[PDB]
CSV table of N, CA and C in Angstrom, one decimal:
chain,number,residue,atom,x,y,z
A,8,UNK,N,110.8,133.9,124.0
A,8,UNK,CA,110.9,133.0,125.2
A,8,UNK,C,111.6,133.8,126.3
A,9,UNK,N,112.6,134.1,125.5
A,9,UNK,CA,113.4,135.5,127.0
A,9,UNK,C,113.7,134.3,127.9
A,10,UNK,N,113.3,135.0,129.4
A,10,UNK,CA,113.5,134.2,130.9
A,10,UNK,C,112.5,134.2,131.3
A,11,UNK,N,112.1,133.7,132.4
A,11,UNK,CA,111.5,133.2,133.5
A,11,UNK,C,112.3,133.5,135.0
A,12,UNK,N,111.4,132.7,135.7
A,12,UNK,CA,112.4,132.4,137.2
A,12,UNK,C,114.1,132.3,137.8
A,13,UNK,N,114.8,133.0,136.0
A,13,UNK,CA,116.0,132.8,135.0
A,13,UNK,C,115.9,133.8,134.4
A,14,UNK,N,114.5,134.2,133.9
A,14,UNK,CA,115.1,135.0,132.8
A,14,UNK,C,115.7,136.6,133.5
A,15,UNK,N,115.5,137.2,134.5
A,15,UNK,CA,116.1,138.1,135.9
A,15,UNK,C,117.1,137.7,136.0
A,16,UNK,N,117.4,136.8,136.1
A,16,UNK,CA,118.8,136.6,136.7
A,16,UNK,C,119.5,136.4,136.0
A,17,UNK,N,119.6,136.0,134.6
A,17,UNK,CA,120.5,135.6,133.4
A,17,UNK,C,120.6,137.2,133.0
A,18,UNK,N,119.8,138.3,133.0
A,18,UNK,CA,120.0,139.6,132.7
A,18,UNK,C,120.3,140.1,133.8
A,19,UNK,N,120.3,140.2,134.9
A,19,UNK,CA,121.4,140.6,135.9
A,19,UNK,C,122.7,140.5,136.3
A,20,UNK,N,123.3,139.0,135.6
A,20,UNK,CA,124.8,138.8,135.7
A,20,UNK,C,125.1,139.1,134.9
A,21,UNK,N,124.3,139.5,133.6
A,21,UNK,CA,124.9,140.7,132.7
A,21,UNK,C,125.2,141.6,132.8
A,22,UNK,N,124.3,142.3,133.4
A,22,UNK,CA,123.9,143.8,133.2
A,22,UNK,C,124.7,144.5,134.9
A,23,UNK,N,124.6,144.1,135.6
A,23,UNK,CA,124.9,143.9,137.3
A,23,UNK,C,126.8,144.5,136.9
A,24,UNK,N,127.6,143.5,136.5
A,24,UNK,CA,129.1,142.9,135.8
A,24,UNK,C,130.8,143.7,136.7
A,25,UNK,N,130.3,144.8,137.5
A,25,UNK,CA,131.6,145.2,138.5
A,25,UNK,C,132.3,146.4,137.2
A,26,UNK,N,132.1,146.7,136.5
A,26,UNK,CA,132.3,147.8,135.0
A,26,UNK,C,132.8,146.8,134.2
A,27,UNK,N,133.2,145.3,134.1
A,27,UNK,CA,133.6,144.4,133.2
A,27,UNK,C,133.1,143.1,133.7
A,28,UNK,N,131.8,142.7,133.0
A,28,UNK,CA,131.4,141.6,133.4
A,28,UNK,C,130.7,141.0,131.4
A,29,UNK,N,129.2,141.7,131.8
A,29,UNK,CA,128.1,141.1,131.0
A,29,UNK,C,128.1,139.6,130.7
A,30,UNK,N,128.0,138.8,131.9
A,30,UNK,CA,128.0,137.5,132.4
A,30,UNK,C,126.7,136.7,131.5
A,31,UNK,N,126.1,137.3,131.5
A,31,UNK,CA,124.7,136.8,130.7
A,31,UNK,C,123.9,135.7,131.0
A,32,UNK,N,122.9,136.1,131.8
A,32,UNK,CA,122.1,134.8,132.6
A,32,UNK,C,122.7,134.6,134.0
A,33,UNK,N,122.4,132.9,134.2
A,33,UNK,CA,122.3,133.0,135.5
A,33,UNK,C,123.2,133.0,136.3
A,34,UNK,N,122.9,133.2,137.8
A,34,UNK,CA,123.4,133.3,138.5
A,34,UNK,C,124.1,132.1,139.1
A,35,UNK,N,125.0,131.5,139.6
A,35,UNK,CA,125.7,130.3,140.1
A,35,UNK,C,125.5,130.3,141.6
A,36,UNK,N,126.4,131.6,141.9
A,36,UNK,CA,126.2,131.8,143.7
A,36,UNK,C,124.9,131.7,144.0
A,37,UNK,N,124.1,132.4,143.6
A,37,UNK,CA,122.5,132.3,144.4
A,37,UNK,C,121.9,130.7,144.3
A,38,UNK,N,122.2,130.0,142.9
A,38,UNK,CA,122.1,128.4,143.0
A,38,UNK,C,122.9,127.8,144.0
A,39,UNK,N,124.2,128.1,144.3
A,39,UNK,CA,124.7,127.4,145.1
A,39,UNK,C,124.4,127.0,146.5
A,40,UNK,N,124.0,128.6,146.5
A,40,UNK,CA,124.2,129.3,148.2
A,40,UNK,C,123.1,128.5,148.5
A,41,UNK,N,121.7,128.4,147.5
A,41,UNK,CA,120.2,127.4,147.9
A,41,UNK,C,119.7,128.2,149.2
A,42,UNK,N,120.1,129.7,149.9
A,42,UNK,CA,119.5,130.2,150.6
A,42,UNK,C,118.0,131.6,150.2
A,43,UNK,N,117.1,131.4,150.5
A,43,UNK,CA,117.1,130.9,151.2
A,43,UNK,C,115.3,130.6,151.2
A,44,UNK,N,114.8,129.8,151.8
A,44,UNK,CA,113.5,128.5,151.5
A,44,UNK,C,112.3,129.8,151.8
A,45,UNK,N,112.1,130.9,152.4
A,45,UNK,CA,111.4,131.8,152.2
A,45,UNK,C,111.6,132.6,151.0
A,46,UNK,N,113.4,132.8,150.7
A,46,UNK,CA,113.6,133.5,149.6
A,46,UNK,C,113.1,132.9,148.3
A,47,UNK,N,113.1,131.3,147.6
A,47,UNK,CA,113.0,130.3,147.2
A,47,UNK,C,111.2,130.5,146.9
A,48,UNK,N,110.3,130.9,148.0
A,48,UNK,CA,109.0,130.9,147.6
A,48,UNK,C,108.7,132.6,147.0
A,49,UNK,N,109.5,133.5,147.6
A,49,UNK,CA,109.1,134.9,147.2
A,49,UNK,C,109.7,135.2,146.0
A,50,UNK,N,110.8,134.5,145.5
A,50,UNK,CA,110.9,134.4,143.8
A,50,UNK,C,110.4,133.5,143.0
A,51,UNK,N,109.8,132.5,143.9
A,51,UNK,CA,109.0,132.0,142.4
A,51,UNK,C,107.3,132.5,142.2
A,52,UNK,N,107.4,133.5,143.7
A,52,UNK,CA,106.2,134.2,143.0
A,52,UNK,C,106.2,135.5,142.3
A,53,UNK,N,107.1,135.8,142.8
A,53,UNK,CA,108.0,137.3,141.5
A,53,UNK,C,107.9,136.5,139.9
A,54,UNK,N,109.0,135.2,139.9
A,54,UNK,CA,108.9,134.6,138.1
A,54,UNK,C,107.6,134.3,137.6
A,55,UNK,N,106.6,133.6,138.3
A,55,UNK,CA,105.5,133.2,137.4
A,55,UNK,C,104.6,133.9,138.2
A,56,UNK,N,104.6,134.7,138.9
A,56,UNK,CA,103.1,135.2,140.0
A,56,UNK,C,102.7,136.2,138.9
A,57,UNK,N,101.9,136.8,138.5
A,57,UNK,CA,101.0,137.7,138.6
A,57,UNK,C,100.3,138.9,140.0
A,58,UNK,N,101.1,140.3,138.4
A,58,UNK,CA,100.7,141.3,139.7
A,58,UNK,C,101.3,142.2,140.2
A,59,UNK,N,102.6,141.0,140.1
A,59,UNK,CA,103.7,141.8,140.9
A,59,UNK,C,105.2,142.1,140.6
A,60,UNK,N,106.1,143.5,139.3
A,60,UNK,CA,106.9,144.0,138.5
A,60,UNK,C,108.4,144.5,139.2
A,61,UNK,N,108.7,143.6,140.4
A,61,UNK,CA,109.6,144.2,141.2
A,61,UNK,C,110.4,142.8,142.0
A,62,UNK,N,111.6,143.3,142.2
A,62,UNK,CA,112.8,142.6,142.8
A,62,UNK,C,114.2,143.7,143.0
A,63,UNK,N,114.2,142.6,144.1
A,63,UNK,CA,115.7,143.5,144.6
A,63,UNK,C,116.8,142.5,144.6
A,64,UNK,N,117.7,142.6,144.8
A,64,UNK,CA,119.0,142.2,144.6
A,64,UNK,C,119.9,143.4,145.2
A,65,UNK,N,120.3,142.6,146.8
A,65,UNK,CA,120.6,143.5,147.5
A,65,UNK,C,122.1,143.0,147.8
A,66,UNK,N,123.5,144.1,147.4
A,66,UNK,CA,124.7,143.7,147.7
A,66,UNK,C,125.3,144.4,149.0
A,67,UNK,N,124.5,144.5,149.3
A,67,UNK,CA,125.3,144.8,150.5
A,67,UNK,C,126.6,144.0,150.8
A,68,UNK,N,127.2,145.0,151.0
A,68,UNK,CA,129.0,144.5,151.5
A,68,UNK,C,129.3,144.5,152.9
A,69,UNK,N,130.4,143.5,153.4
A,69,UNK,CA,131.0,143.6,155.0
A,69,UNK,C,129.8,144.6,155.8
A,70,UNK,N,130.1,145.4,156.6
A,70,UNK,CA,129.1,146.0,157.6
A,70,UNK,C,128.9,145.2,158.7
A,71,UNK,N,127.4,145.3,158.9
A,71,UNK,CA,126.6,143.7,160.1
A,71,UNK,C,125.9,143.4,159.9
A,72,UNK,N,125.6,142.1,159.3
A,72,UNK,CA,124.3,141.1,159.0
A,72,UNK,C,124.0,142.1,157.6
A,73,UNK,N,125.3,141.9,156.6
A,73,UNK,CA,124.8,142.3,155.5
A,73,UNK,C,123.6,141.7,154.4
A,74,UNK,N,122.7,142.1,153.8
A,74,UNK,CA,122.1,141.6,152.7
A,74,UNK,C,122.9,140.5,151.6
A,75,UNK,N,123.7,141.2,151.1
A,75,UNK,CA,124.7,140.8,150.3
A,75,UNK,C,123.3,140.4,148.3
A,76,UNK,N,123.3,139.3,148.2
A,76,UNK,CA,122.3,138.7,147.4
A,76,UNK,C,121.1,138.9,147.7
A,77,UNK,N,120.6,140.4,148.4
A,77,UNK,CA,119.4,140.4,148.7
A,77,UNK,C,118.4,140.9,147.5
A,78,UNK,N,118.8,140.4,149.4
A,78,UNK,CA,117.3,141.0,148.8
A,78,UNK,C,116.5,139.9,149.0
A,79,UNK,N,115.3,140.4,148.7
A,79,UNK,CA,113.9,140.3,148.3
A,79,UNK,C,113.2,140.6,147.3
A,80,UNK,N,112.1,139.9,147.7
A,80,UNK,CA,110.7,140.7,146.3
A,80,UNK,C,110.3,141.7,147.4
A,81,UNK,N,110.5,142.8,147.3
A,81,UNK,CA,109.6,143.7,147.8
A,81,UNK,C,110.6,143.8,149.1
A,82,UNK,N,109.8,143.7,150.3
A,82,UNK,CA,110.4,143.7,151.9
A,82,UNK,C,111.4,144.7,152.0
A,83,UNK,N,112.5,144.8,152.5
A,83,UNK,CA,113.0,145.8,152.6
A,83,UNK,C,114.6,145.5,152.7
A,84,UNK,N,115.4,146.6,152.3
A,84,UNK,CA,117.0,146.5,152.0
A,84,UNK,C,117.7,147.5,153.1
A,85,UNK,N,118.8,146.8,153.8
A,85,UNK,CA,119.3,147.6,155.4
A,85,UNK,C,120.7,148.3,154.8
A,86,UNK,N,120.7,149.3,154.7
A,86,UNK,CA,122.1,150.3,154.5
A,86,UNK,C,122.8,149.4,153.1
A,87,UNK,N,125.9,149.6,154.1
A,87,UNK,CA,126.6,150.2,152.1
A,87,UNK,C,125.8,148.7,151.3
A,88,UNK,N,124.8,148.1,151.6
A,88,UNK,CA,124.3,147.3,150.6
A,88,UNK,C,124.4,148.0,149.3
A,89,UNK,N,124.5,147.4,148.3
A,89,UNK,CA,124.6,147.2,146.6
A,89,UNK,C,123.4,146.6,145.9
A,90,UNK,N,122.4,146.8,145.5
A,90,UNK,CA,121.4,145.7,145.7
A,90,UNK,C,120.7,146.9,144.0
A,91,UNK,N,119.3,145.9,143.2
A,91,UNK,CA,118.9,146.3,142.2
A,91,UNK,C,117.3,145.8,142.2
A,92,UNK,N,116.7,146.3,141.7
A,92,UNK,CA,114.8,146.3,141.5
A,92,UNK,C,114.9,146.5,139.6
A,93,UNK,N,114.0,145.3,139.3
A,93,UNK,CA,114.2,145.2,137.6
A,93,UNK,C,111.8,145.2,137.7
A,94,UNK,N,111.9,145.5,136.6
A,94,UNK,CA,109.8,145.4,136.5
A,94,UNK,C,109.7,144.5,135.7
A,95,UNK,N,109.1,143.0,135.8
A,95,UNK,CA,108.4,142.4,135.0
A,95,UNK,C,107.0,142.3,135.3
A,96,UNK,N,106.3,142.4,134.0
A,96,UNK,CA,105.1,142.2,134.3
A,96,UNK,C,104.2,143.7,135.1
A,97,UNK,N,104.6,144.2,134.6
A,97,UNK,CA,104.3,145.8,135.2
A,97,UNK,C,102.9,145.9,135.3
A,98,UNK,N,98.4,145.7,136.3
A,98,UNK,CA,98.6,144.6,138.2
A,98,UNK,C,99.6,143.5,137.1
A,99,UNK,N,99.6,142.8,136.1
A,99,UNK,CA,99.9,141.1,135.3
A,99,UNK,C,99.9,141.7,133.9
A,100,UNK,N,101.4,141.8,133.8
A,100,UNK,CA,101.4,141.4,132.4
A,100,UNK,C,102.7,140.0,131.7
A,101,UNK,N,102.5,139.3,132.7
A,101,UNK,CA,102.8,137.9,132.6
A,101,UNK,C,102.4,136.8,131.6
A,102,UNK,N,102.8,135.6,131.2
A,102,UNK,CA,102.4,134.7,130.4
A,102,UNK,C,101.8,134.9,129.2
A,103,UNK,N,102.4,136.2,128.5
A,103,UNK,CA,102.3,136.8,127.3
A,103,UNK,C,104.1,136.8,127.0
A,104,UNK,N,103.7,138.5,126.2
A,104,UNK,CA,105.5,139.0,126.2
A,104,UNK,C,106.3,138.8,127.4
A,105,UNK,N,107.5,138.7,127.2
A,105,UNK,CA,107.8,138.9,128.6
A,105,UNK,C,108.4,139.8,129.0
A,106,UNK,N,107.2,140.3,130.1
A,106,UNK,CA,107.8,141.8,130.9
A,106,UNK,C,108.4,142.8,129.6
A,107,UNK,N,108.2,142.7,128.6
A,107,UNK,CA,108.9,143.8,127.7
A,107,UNK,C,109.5,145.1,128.8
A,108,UNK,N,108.0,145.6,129.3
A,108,UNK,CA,108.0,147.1,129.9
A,108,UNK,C,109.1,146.9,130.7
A,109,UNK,N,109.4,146.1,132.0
A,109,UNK,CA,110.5,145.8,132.5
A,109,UNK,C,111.5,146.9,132.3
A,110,UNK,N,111.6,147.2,133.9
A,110,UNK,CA,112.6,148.6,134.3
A,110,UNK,C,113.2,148.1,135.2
A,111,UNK,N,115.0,148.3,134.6
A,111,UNK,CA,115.6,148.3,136.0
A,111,UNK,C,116.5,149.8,136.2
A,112,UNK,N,117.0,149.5,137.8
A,112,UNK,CA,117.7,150.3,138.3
A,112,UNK,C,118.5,149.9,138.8
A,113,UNK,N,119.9,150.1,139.1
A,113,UNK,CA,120.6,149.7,140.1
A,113,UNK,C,120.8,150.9,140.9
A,114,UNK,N,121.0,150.0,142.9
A,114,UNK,CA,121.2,151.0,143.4
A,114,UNK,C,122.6,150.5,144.4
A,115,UNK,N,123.4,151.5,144.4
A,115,UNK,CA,124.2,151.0,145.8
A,115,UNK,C,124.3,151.1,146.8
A,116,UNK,N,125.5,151.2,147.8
A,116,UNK,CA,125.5,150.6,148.7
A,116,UNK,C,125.2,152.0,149.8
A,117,UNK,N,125.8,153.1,149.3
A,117,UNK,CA,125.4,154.7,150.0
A,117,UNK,C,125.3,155.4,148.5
A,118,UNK,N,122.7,161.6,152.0
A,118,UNK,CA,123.2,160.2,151.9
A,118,UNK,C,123.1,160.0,150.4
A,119,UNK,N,124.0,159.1,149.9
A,119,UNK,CA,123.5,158.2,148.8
A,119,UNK,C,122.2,158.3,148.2
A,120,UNK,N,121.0,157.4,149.2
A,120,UNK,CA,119.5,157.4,149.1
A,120,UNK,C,119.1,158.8,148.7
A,121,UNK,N,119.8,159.8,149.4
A,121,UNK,CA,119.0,161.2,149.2
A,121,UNK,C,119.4,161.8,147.5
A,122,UNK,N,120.4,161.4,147.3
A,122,UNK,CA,120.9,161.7,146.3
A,122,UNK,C,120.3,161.0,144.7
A,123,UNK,N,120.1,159.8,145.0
A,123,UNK,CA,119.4,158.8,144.3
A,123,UNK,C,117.5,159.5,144.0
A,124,UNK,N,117.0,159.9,145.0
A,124,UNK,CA,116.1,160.4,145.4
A,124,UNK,C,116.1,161.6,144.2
A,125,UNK,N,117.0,162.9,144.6
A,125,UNK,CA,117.2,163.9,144.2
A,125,UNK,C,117.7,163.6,142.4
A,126,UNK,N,117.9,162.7,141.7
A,126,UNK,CA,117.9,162.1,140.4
A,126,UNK,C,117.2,162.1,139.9
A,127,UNK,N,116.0,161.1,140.7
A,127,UNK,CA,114.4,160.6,140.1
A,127,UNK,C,113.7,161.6,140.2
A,128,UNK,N,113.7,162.5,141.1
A,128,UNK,CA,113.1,164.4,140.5
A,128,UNK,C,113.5,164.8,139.7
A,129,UNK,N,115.1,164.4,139.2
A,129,UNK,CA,115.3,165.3,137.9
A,129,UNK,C,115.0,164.3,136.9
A,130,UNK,N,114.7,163.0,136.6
A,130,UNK,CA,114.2,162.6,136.0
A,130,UNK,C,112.7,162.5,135.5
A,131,UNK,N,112.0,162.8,136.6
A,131,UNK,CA,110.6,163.3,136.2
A,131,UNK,C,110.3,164.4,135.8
A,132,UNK,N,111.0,165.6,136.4
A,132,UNK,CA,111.0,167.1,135.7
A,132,UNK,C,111.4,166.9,134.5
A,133,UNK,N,112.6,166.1,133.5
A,133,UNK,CA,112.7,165.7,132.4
A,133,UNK,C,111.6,165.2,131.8
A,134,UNK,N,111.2,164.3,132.4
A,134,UNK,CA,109.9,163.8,131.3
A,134,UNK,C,108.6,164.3,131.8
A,135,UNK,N,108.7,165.5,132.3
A,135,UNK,CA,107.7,166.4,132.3
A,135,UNK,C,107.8,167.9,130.9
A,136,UNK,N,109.4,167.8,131.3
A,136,UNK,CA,109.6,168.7,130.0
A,136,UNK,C,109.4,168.3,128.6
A,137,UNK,N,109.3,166.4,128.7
A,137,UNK,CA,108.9,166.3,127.2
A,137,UNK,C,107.5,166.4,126.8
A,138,UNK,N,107.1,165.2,127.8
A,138,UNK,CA,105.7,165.6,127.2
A,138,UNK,C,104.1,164.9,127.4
A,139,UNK,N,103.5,165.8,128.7
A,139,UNK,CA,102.2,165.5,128.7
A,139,UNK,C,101.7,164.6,129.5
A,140,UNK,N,102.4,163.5,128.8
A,140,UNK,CA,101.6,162.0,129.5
A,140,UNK,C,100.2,161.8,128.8
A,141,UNK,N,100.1,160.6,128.9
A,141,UNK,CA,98.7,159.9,128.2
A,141,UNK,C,97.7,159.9,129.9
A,142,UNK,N,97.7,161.4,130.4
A,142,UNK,CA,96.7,161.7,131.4
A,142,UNK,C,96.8,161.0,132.6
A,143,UNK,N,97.9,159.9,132.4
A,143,UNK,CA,97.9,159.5,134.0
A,143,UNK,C,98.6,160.3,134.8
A,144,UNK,N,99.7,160.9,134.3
A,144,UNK,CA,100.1,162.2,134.9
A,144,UNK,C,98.9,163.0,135.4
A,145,UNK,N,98.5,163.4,133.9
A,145,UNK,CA,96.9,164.9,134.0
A,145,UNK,C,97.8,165.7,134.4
A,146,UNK,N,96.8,166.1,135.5
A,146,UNK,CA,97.8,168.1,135.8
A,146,UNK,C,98.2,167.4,136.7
């Protein structure tokens, strides 16, 4: 059964935690806050939509016109934001398993990006060194 429109967010207040948290499930502030009625439709088509393996969760901190709980599905995240992209359903693999494949990352707030960037090359050079790929790689 896992989550739903819940089940992201109950594994984000875990996993998310400040180095001591693993909160487990959902989130309270983002219930509270009820912001916001665009945000409200672009997650509930992230939970049950089809298609589409991505979210952000954007923390941006102080600054101006921070994100903070951003984020979006998709759209875009502004600077020291703190924010995270998790994959369910990696076009639909929805209303089966759930999201098994499901990949997250967290990213923060700082550049930073460049550096983050300069990772994910060493992590594909890594799994270039292991092995092959089932051809979607190819050459």
């Amino acid at each position: 059964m896992g989550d739903h429109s819940q089940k992201d967010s109950p594994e984000d207040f875990i996993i998310n935690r400040l180095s001591q948290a693993l909160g487990i499930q959902k989130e309270k502030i983002k219930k509270s806050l009820e912001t916001a009625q665009d945000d409200k439709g672009e997650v509930t088509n992230k939970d049950e939509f089809q298609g589409f393996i991505q979210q952000d969760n954007s923390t941006n901190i102080l600054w101006v016109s921070g994100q903070s709980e951003k984020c979006t599905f998709y759209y875009g995240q502004l600077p020291p934001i703190d924010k995270f992209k998790k994959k369910g359903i990696a076009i639909k693999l929805g209303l089966h398993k759930l999201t098994n494949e499901n990949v997250a990352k967290d990213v923060v707030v700082v550049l930073l990006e460049h550096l983050n960037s300069v990772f994910n090359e060493i992590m594909s050079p890594v799994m270039q060194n292991p092995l092959n790929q089932q051809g979607w790689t190819d050459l």
